[PDB]
Design a protein around this nucleic acid. Structure first.
Lengths: 69, 338, 102, 48, 48, 160
RNA sequence: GUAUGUAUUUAUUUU
RNA sequence: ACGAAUCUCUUUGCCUUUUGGCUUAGAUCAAGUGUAGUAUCUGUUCUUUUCA
RNA sequence: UUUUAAGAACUAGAUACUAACAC
RNA sequence: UUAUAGUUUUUUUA
């Protein structure tokens, strides 16, 4: 008994109802009026855009190359 | 995309380790022999090492209980088990999966592997056995030191005493300079490449045991549903995954030094130095490189320079990276604490 | 081959009940208005009480024969196939839908 | 035609299913072949 | 043809997603190409 | 403690997988006694699962084999997939390929347990409903033959 | 250790 | 001869009681003890029919 | 017009689920 | 073991 909804409640079922009279909070009058417009170094062994995707991205692979570590 | 190293680099590296070793005149390890003089001792150690995970616990879960069984018998029947293992290494190449679960730092994360108990017990024996035979035969030279003799802060200390009390660094009379590198190896293991390994281990260890390792890595990895063979990099939670790790970095090192300067640091195998030692001051001064110390990842190096050599470098560098900007001081980084 | 559009099908059934209706009428030869209300907009048609009952009875017997095709189809279909695992009825049903697939 | 769901994880009525509704191409890159055989060459040189 | 075909295709939706978690490459053996496009589209959307 | 695999418990498994699907194993080791998650799924993926390839060699598979396994020193599960052949079998038939070189009681009671378990799909709530509803029907029948026997006395008592 | 749910008709509705 | 109709069966088409959500696979998955209510698993021994 | 259960008696308990009941 | 006891991540030493 979990069912995925297939629907939504038509406003009409509400619309027929009679009112309440409760007053909520956010309806207190505010913004009450509008506005208008007018040598050694040789020793060592060696002789001398935006890619639309995510887990292949450059950033994201940096990030996860930091944090999960 | 195939193997990255290219065969070229491969050959160069291997040859390096080779002339090191033969020049170093080192005898490789034999597989643990059937008649061994030390053996049950070593197994004493490893098993206590597993024991200690569970010393504290009160609730013991299923795999655990499985373990304590496997242990208790292992105490009881040392010649039994020793035979069981030496069998296992001589043969078995295929292994149960492995389990990652990541553990949290609230800032970063770290992988926590889990092996499977028999595989563990073998390993721990072999881990222990490696370190003992190696350090017995003085594999690693001084300068590789997350080592025995020095707990970390003491390592800092003798590293200072190294810095200073070597001859002369503080005479600025001319232009004279000295420069430390602080580094990481980036990914280090996660590029460790088996086919390279199993060879480089054919150097220092019997073809079998090494085989047991290279074939000891690849496993499935089950994180819950997600699962994949591990074909390439390195799983460190393997009991021995320390050792080879150090090993591999040695290869890095014999590069960064290059043969000679290493031969400074080691001296003969007959007279390997203490940490900070040389023979004459010149042994320091035969080269710009004075200290080299590599701790796990971080590499730490000390160059001693005079305007001659150093301005010949900045001749190289500058020559190839002229900056009329003079902005090379922007991204450059030093400490925010001081 | 195949699937028939819901159009052509409705036509074909129209033909079948055509010819069936024809066996009604003709077989009834073998075995042998519109008024409107000026007062209100209602219309009044006069029909025989005959042929209304043949109509209804025909409908009922159709519902019967179809109902019985479906029922006998239950019996046979659920007795026959013995292969796939079945926990309950609906495993046999659905699972035979997965057999209907390929 | 849309196939019918057989989902490795949930089985919300308990229905049972023939396994295969529940349940590579390339080879290697010869970079390998060259790698191991080059390692091999330098190897046998060295031992010699 | 809607109701059953629809809902069951959604079951393919979810199954597709929790594939993409587990990394399952998710090739349903055969299935209309465009619908499969839709699934890829959305699962990208929810993915990001 | 050391076990081996009867085709009894093996069959109970393949039935279980044939219901719960692969990745729910912690249930598949419930029916199955004697065994664990990793044990179950270990033998499953490594052996039992039919999609694996069990067959002989071929010279494709063979020259293929000595090729790959010679190139890659030991990596078996990699090479395995390279053969599309099961791991330890490729290992085995390999070693043989170089070996041509030479010089019913309480198990019937557990099967009663699982065989009884699979057959109820609902969960505690639905069963609870089955009961409650039948109990309602007993209430109806009772209250009826109440009224029936009261009609056999002729006194007619109306229903609530 | 509990939420939660269910029934609790006494005072005669015309043959 | 074939036109028409009833019944029966086979095939095809249409699927008829034919998987109804999400989050970290939602998380977790074994070590106990005595007695007691109730479910059920097996053996043995005997006998193969009708009327008011 | 439908139908037919092998029948009867004897026996112990093992694995069981659970218990605001006994460290 | 008591004046309880589903969510309040249930369980470790110097």
């Amino acid at each position: 008994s979990h069912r995925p909804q297939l629907e939504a409640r038509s406003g009409a079922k509400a619309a027929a109802y009679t009112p309440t009279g409760i007053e909520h909070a956010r309806l207190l009058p505010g913004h009450t009026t509008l506005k208008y417009r007018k040598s050694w170094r040789k020793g060592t062994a060696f002789g001398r855009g935006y890619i639309n995707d995510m887990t292949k991205s450059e950033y994201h692979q940096e990030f996860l190359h930091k944090h999960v570590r | 995309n195939g193997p990255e190293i290219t065969p070229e680099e491969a050959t160069t590296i291997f040859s390096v380790m080779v002339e090191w070793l033969e020049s170093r005149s080192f005898s490789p390890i034999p597989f643990p022999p059937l008649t061994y003089k030390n053996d049950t001792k070593i197994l004493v150690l490893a098993l206590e090492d597993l024991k200690d995970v569970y010393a504290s616990k009160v609730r013991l879960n299923a795999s655990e209980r499985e373990e304590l069984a496997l242990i208790e018998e292992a105490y009881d029947n040392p010649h039994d088990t020793l035979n069981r293992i030496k069998k296992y290494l001589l043969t078995q190449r295929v292994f149960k999966p492995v389990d990652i679960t990541m553990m949290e730092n609230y800032q970063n994360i770290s992988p926590v592997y889990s092996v499977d108990p028999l595989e563990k017990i073998t390993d721990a024996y072999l881990d222990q056995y490696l370190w003992y035979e190696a350090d017995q035969r003085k594999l690693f030279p001084n300068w590789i030191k997350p080592s025995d003799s020095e707990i970390p802060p003491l390592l800092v200390y003798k590293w200072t005493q190294g810095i200073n009390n070597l001859s002369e660094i503080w005479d600025v009379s001319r232009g004279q300079s000295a420069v430390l590198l602080e580094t990481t190896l980036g990914e280090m293991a996660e590029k460790i490449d088996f086919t390279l390994l199993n060879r480089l281990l054919r150097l220092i260890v019997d073809p079998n045991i090494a085989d047991y390792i290279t074939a000891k890595n690849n496993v499935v990895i089950n994180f819950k549903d997600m699962s994949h063979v591990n074909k390439y990099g390195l799983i460190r939670g393997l009991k021995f995954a320390s050792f080879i790790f150090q090993y591999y970095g040695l290869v890095i090192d014999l590069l960064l030094l290059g043969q000679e300067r290493a031969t400074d640091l080691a001296g003969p195998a007959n007279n390997p130095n203490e940490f900070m030692q040389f023979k004459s001051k010149e042994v320091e001064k035969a080269h710009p490189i004075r200290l080299y110390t590599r701790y796990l990842d971080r590499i730490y190096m000390l160059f001693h320079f005079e305007e001659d050599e150093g301005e010949e470098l900045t001749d190289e560098y500058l020559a190839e990276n002229p900056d009329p900007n003079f902005e090379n001081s922007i991204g450059y980084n030093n400490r925010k604490c001081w | 081959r195949g699937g028939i559009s819901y159009d052509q099908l409705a036509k074909l059934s129209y033909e079948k009940t055509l010819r069936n209706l024809a066996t009604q009428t003709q077989n009834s030869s073998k075995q042998d208005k519109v008024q409107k209300d000026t007062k209100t907009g209602k219309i009044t048609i006069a029909d025989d009480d005959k042929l209304v009952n043949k109509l209804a009875v025909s409908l009922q017997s159709e519902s019967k024969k179809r109902y019985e095709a479906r029922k006998r189809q239950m019996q046979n279909a659920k007795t026959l196939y013995g292969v796939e695992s079945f926990i309950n009825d609906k495993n046999k049903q659905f699972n035979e839908k997965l057999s209907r697939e390929s | 035609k849309i196939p019918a769901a057989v989902s490795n994880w949930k089985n919300p009525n308990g229905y049972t299913v023939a396994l295969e509704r529940r349940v590579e191409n390339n080879t290697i890159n010869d970079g390998f072949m060259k790698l191991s055989e080059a390692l091999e060459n330098a190897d046998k040189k060295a031992r010699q | 043809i809607r109701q059953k075909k629809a809902r069951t295709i959604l079951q393919h939706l979810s199954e597709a997603w929790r594939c993409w978690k587990a990394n399952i490459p998710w090739d349903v053996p055969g299935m209309p190409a465009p619908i499969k496009k839709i699934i890829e589209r959305y699962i990208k959307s929810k993915a990001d | 403690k050391g076990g081996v695999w009867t085709n009894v418990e093996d069959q109970i498994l393949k039935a279980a997988v044939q219901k719960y699907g692969t990745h729910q194993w912690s249930k598949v080791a419930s029916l199955l006694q004697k065994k664990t998650a990793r044990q179950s799924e270990l033998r499953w993926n490594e052996y039992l699962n039919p999609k694996l390839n069990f067959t002989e060699f071929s010279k494709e598979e063979d020259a293929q084999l000595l090729d790959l396994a010679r190139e890659l020193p030991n990596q078996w599960r990699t090479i395995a997939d390279m053969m599309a052949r099961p791991a330890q079998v490729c290992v085995e038939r390999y070693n043989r390929l170089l070996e041509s070189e030479d010089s019913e009681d309480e198990e019937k009671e557990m099967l009663a347990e699982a065989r009884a378990r699979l057959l109820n799909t609902q969960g505690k709530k639905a069963t609870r409903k089955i009961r409650e509803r039948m109990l309602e029907e007993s209430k109806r029948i009772a209250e009826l033959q109440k009224r029936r026997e009261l009609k056999q006395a002729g006194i007619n008592v109306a229903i609530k």
